[PDB]
Every structure is written in structure tokens, then in C-alpha cells.
PDB file of C-alpha atoms in Angstrom:
ATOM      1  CA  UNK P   1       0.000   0.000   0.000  1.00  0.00           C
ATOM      2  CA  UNK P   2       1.807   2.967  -1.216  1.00  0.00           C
ATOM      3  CA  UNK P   3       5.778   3.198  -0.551  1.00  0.00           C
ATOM      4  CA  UNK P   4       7.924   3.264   1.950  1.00  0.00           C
ATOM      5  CA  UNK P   5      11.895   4.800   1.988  1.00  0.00           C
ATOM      6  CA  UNK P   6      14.247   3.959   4.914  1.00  0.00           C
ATOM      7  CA  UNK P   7      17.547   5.764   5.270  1.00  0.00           C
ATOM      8  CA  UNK P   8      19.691   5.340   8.771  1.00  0.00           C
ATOM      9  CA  UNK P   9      21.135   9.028  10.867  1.00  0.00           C
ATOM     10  CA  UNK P  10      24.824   7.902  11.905  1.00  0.00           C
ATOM     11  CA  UNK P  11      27.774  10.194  12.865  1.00  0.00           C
ATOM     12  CA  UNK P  12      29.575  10.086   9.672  1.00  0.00           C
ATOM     13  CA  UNK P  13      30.789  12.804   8.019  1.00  0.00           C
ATOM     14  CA  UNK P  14      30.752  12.899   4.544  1.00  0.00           C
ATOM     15  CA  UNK P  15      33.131  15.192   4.282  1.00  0.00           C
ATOM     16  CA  UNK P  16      36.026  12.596   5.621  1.00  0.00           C
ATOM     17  CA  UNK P  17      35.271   8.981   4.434  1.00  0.00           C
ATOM     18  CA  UNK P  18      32.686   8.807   6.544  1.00  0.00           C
ATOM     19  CA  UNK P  19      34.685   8.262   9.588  1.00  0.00           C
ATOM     20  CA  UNK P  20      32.498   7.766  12.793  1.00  0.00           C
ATOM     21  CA  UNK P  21      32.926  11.115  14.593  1.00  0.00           C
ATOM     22  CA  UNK P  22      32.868  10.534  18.952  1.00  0.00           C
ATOM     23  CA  UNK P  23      31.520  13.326  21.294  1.00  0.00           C
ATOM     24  CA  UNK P  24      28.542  14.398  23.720  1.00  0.00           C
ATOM     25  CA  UNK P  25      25.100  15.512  21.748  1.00  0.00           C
ATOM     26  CA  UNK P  26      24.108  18.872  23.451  1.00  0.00           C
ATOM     27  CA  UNK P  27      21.176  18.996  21.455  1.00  0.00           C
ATOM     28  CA  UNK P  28      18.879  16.896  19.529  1.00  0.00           C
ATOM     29  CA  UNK P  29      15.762  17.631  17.965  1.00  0.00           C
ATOM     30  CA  UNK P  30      13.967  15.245  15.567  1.00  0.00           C
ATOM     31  CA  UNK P  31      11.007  15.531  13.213  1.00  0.00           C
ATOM     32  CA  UNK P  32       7.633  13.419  14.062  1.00  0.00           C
ATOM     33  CA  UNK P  33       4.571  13.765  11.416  1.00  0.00           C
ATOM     34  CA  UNK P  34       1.859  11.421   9.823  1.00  0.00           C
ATOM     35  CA  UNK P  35       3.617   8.111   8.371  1.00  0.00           C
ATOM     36  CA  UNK P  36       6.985   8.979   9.653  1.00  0.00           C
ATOM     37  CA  UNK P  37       9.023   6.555  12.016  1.00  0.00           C
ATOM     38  CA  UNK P  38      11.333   7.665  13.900  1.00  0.00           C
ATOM     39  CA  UNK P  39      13.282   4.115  15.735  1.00  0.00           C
ATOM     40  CA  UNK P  40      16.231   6.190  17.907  1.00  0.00           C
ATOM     41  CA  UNK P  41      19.321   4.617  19.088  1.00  0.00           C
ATOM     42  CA  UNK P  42      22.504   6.803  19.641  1.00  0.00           C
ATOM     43  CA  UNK P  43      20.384  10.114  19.425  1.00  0.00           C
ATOM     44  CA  UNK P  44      19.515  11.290  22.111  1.00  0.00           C
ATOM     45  CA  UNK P  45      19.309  15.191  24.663  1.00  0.00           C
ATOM     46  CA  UNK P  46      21.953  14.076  26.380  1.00  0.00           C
ATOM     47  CA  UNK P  47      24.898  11.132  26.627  1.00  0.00           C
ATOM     48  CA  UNK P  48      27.916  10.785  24.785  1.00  0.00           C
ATOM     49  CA  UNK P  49      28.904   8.545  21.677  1.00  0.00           C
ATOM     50  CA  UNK P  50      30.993   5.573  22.133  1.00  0.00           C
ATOM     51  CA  UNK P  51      33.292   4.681  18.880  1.00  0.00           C
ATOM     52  CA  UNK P  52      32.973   0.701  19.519  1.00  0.00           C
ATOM     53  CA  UNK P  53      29.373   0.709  18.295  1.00  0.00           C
ATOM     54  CA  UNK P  54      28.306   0.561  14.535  1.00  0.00           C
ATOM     55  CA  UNK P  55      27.020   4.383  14.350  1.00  0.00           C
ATOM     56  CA  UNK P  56      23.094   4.762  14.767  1.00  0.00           C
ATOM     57  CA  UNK P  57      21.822   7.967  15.638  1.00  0.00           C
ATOM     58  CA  UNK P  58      18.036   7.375  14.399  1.00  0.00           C
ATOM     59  CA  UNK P  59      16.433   5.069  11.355  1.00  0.00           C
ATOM     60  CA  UNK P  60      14.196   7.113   9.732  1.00  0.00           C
ATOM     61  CA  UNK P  61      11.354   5.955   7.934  1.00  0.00           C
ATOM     62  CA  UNK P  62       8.755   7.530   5.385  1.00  0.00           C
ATOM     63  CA  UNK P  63       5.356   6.159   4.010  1.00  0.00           C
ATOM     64  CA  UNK P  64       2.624   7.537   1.413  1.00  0.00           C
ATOM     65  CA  UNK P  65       0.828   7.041  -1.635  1.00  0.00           C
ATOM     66  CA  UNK P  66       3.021   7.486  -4.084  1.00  0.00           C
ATOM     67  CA  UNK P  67       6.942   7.402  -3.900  1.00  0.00           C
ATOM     68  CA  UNK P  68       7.282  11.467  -4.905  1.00  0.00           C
ATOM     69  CA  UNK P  69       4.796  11.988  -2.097  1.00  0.00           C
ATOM     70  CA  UNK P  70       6.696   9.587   0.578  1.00  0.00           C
ATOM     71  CA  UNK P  71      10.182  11.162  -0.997  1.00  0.00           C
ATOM     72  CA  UNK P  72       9.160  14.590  -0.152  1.00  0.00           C
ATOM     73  CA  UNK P  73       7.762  13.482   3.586  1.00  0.00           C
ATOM     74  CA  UNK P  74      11.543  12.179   3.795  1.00  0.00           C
ATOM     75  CA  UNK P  75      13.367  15.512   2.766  1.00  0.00           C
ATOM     76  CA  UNK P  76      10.763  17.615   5.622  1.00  0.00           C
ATOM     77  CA  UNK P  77      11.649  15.089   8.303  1.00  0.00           C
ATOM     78  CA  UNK P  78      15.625  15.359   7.171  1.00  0.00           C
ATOM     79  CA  UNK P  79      15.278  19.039   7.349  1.00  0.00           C
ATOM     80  CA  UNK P  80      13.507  19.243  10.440  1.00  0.00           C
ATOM     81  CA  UNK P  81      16.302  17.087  12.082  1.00  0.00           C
ATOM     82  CA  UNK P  82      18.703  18.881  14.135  1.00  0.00           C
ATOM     83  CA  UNK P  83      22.032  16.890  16.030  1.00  0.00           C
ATOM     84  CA  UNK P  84      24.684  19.211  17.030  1.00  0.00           C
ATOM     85  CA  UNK P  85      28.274  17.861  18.930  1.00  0.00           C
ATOM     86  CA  UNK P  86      28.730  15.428  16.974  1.00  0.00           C
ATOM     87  CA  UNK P  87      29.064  15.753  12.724  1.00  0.00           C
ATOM     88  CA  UNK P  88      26.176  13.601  10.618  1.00  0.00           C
ATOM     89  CA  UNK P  89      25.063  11.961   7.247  1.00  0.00           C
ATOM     90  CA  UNK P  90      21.803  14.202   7.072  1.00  0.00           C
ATOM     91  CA  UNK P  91      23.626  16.825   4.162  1.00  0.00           C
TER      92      UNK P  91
ATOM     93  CA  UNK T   1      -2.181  -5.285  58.153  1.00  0.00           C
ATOM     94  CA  UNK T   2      -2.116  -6.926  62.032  1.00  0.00           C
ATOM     95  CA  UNK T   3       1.617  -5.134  61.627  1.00  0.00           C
ATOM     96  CA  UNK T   4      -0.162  -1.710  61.456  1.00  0.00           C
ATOM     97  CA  UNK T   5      -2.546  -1.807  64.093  1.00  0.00           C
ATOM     98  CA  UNK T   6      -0.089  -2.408  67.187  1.00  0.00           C
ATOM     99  CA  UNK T   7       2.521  -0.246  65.533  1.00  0.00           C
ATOM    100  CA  UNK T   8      -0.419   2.081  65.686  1.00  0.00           C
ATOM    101  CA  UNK T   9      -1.299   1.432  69.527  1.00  0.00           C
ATOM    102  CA  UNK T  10       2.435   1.173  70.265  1.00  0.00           C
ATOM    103  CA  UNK T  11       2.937   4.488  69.089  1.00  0.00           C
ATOM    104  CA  UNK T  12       0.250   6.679  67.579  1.00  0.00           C
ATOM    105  CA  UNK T  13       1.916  10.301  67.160  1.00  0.00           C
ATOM    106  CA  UNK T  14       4.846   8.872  65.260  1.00  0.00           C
ATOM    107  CA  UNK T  15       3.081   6.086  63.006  1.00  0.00           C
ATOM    108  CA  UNK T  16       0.930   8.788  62.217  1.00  0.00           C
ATOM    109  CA  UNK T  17       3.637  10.731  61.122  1.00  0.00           C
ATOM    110  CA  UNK T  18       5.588   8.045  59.382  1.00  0.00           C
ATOM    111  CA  UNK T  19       2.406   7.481  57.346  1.00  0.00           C
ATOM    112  CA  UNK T  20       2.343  10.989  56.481  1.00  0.00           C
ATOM    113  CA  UNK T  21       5.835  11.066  54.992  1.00  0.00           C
ATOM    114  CA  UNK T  22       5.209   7.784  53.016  1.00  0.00           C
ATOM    115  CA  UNK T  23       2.333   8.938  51.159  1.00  0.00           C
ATOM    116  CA  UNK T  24       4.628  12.192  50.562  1.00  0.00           C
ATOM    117  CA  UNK T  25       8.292  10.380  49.894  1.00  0.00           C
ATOM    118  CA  UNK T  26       7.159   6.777  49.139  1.00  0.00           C
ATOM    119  CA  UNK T  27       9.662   4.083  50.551  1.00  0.00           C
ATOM    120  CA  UNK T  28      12.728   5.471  52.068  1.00  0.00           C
ATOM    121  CA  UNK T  29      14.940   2.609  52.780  1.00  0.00           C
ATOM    122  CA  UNK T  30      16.136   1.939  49.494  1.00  0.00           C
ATOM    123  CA  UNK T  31      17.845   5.311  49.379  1.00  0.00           C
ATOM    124  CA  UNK T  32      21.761   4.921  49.981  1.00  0.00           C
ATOM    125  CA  UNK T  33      22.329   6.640  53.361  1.00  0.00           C
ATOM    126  CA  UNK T  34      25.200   9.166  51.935  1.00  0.00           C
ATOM    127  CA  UNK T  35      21.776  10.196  49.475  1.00  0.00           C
ATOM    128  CA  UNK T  36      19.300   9.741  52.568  1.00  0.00           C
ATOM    129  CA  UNK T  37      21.451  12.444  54.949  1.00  0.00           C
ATOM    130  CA  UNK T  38      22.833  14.718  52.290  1.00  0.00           C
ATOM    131  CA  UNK T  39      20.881  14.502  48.686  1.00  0.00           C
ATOM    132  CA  UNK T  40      22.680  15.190  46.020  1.00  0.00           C
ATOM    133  CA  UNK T  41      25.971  17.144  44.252  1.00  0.00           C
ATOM    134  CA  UNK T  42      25.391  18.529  41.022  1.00  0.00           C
ATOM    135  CA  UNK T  43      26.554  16.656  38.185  1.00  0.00           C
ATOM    136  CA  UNK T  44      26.393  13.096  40.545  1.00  0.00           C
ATOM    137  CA  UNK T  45      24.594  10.074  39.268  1.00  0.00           C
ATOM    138  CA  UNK T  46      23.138   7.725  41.685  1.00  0.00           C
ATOM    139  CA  UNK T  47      21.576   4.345  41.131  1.00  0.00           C
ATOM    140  CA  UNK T  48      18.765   3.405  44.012  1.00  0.00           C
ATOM    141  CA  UNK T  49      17.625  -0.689  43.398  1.00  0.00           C
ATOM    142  CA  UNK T  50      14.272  -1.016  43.802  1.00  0.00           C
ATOM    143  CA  UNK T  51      13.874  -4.706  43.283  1.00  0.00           C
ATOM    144  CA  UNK T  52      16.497  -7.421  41.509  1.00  0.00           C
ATOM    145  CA  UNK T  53      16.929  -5.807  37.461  1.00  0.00           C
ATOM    146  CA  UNK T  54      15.095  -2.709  38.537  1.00  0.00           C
ATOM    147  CA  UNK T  55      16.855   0.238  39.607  1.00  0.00           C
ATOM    148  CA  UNK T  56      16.603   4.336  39.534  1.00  0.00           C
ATOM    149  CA  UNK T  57      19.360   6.563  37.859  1.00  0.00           C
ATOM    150  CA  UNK T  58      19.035   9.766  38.513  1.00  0.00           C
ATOM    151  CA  UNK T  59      21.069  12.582  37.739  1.00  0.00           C
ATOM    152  CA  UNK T  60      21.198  15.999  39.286  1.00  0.00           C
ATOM    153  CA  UNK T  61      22.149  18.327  36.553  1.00  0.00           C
ATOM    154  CA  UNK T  62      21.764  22.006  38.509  1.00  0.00           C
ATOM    155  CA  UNK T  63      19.741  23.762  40.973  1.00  0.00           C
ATOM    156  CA  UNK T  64      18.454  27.410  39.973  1.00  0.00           C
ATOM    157  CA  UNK T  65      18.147  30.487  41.991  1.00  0.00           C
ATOM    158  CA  UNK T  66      15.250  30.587  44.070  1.00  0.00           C
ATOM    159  CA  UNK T  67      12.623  32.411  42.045  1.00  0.00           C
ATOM    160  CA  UNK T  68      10.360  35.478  42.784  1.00  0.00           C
ATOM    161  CA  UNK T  69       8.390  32.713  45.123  1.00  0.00           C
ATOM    162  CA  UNK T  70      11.386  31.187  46.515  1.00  0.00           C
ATOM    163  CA  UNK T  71      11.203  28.172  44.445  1.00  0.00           C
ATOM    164  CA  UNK T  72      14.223  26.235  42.657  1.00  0.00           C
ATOM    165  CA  UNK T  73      14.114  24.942  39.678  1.00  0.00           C
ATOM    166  CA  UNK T  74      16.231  21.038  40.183  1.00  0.00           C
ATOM    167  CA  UNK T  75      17.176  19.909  36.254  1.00  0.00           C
ATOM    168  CA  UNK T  76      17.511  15.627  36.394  1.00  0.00           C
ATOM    169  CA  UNK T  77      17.746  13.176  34.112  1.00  0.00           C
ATOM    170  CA  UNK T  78      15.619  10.320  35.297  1.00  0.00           C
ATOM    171  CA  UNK T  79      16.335   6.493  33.503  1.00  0.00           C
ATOM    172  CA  UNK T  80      17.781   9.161  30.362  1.00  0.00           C
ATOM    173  CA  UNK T  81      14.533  11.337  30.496  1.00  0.00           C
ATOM    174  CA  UNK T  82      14.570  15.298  31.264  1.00  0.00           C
ATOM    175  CA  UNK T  83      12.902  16.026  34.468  1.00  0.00           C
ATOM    176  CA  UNK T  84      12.084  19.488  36.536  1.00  0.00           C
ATOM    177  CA  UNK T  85      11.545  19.593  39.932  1.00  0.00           C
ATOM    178  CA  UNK T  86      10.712  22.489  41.718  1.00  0.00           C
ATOM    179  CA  UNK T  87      11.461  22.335  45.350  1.00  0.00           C
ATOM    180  CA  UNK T  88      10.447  25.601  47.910  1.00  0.00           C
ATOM    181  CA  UNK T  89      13.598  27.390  49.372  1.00  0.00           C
ATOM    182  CA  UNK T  90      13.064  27.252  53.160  1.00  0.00           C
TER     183      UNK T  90
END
């Protein structure tokens, strides 16, 4: 019924190989909406990021009618998220 | 219970009382006694067991100045969840 897109928050930055960045997450704010799934891991107000851990900040999930219509309730939700202290995937 | 009522007739002023600050405090005696005679120190973490696999960790983040009613604003973090408490300045 419709379509559904997955992608997964982590703290790689694109910008280096996509080496998993360490540090404390002083603030987190994610998205929330109608057929959006938000399954949290590493993200979170307030503890740090151990490196031994394959990087999840938050799975993100999207679901409409039609794929242009669950792609653009993907891109709101990505722009809506908000993780500073640590670098991410989200750009 | 049987347990309350001579408690009760043993001594009535301070069961009283001690019922009082349960329904206020809940159960005491799981506090550590450095936490039951002194509270807290910001940024300390302290884990109460309340039964075996179930246990509180709270953190006391800060304490704010007493506002314009003399009331402090305590932040926590309760089992990883923001919490406010606001306590009066006596």
C-alpha cells in the first residue's frame, strides 16, 4: 500500500570517508509527522557517543501514496532534524 | 495489616507521622544513606535498586536560583529522560 523509503542518521561525516565522529550531543531535535518513524538509538538530549558501536543515531522511515509523495515526507523530516556535537550523514 | 494496628497502639503520634511522609516520599529505605542524609551534588549520578533488574538513575544536573516565590528549579535526568523539579527554598 503505497511506498515506503528507509535511510539510517549515523555520525559520519561525509566530508572525511565517513569516519564515525565521537563526542557528547548537546542537542537533539527530531522531526515526528503522519507516516513517519522515527526508531532512535545513539540520538539522544543528552549522553555521549561511544566509537565501539556501529554508528546509529536514528532510522528514519517515510510512508505515502506514491513514492514522490513519501520522498518529499523524507526531505521535511531530514530538514527538520537537528544533532549538534557530533558531525552527521543528514547533508 | 495486624503489623499496622499495634505499631499504631504502640505508638500513635509517630506512626501517624511516618504514614504521612510515606504517602509524601514513598519508601525510604532503598535510598543509599550518603543520598538519605545529604541529597545530592550537582553533576552526581546515583543508582537506588528497587527490586532485583530494577533500579533508579538519577542525575542531578543544577539547581536554579530561588525564584520570585522562593522556588528552585532542580534539572535531572531520570532512567535518560529530562525532568524538573521544583522544590520551595526554606
Amino acid at each position: 500500500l503505497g511506498y515506503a523509503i528507509q535511510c539510517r542518521i549515523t555520525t559520519e561525516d561525509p566530508l572525511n570517508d565517513f569516519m564515525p565522529d565521537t563526542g557528547t550531543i548537546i542537542a537533539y531535535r527530531s522531526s515526528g509527522g503522519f507516516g513517519v518513524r522515527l526508531d532512535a538509538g545513539d540520538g539522544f538530549q543528552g549522553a555521549e557517543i561511544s566509537p565501539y558501536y556501529d554508528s546509529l543515531l536514528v532510522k528514519l522511515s517515510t510512508h505515502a501514496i506514491s513514492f514522490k509523495q513519501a520522498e518529499e515526507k523524507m526531505v521535511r523530516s531530514l530538514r527538520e532534524m537537528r544533532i549538534r556535537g557530533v558531525k552527521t550523514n543528514i547533508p | 495489616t495486624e503489623q499496622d494496628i499495634i505499631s499504631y497502639v504502640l505508638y500513635p503520634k509517630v506512626y501517624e507521622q511516618y504514614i504521612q511522609t510515606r504517602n509524601q516520599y514513598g519508601n525510604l529505605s532503598l535510598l543509599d544513606t550518603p543520598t538519605f542524609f545529604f541529597g545530592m551534588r550537582n553533576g552526581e549520578t546515583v543508582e537506588i535498586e528497587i527490586d532485583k533488574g530494577k533500579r533508579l538513575i538519577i542525575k542531578l544536573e543544577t539547581i536554579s536560583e530561588p525564584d520570585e516565590n522562593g522556588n528552585r528549579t532542580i534539572y535531572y535526568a531520570m532512567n535518560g529522560q529530562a525532568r524538573r523539579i521544583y522544590i520551595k527554598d526554606e
